[PDB]
Amino acid sequence: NPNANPNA
């Protein structure tokens, strides 16, 4: 998912 959570 390119829109998966990218954050820590």
Place this chain on the structure above:
Amino acid sequence: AVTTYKLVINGKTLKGETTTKAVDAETAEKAFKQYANDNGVDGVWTYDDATKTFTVTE
């Protein structure tokens, strides 16, 4: 190899200055005459070697 020349435009309705980079005065003048031509300026050309500055006077 390349140095900055200036053009002073002293026209009847167009007045100001611009620059070009060129290897010699002859090449700079060709660019400046094209620029003046593109602005409809037809004038007498003079040159000051100390300031590497051409002037075109209408």
Place this chain on the structure above:
Amino acid sequence: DIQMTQSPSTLSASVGDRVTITCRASQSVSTSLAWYQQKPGKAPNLLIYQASTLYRGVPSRFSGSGSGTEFTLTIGSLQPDDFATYYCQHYNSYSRITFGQGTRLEIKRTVAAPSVFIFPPSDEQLKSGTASVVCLLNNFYPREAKVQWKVDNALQSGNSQESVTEQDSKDSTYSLSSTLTLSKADYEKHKVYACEVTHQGLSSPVTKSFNRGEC
């Protein structure tokens, strides 16, 4: 890619009005959809996400609705600060992000017909081998206008470019320029140059014209 399409492209309104703009997706994005506000020279600012959740600090007069392929942004009672462009953006799972093309919210005012002005090419430019003819439509409203070039009463198309100003800060009008560019050779082959303007404020089309060489 998913295609986002906003409607209308431009919406006219007054302070205090309620307005609604629409965003449509080419396939379902569930509620993975946000709205942004943008003004000239600034980056966008987030307003709403997950279709209906207001972002921190956004005024309560903003709201959003919809799901799947159809979404709306509503502003309940417009304030001056709200005149701007609005964009939607999806972030559907397994689909790369795309944005709508924008809806501009402009200020409504009374109809104002344009003043129409034409400028022949200058002798300076003619010397250089080109001819630019400029038609100016000044301070009109609404923005929609038709500018038709005619050379020896022959309709000309594909040889001109238009530019339009932003809505004016003071009187809420627009101005428009149309520039017809020809080679000198083509220019010298004709006599009468005219621009004909159609606009809601004009009972009949207005034509300004000149004869090559008359000026």
Place this chain on the structure above:
Amino acid sequence: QVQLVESGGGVVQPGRSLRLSCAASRLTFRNFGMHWVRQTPGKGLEWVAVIWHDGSNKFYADSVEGRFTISRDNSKNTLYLQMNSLRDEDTAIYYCAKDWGGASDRVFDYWGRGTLVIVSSASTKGPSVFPLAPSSKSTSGGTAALGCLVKDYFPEPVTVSWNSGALTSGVHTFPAVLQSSGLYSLSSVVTVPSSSLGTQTYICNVNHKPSNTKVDKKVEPKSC
């Protein structure tokens, strides 16, 4: 107050490369995903790429995959975009955008001011400045229009004023258009009382900093 500042934009020929950077201030940078978003001449917005907080994952728009590389240095709170094989379709304002941090929503809470990237084979060139001369053809009742056509320059921008800044009322300086030449052109016009044409001198002041051009054009009325 979170601040993001991009750098590295400029004019480049197609096929060349360029590296953008974005420096983040007053932000625990390493905690957040970061994105690049660009805005096209037509004012369209296009998401470009995202990078995970620790750089362990990246995703790209179809338009740029294989040509652009997103990276970050969390030691310096800096985001990068390496752009190779640039195309004219890549011309845009590039913004770094912070991921707002909610797991389920890819939305951008903070944006930089943007850095401009122009992809063109054109060379720097100063403008030709032609009069839009007032005449009966540019008279409407008691109002006359006049202006300057500022043509065939590259790159943007040019600045135009009237009478060295003393004339501002009634001026419209139009957004530039890109010609089939690859060169830009704009007009600046002003409306004035028709009765002023014989007494007031009107001069447009044109400044094109990329070519170091500074010229004034006196716009004289026509008899017709």
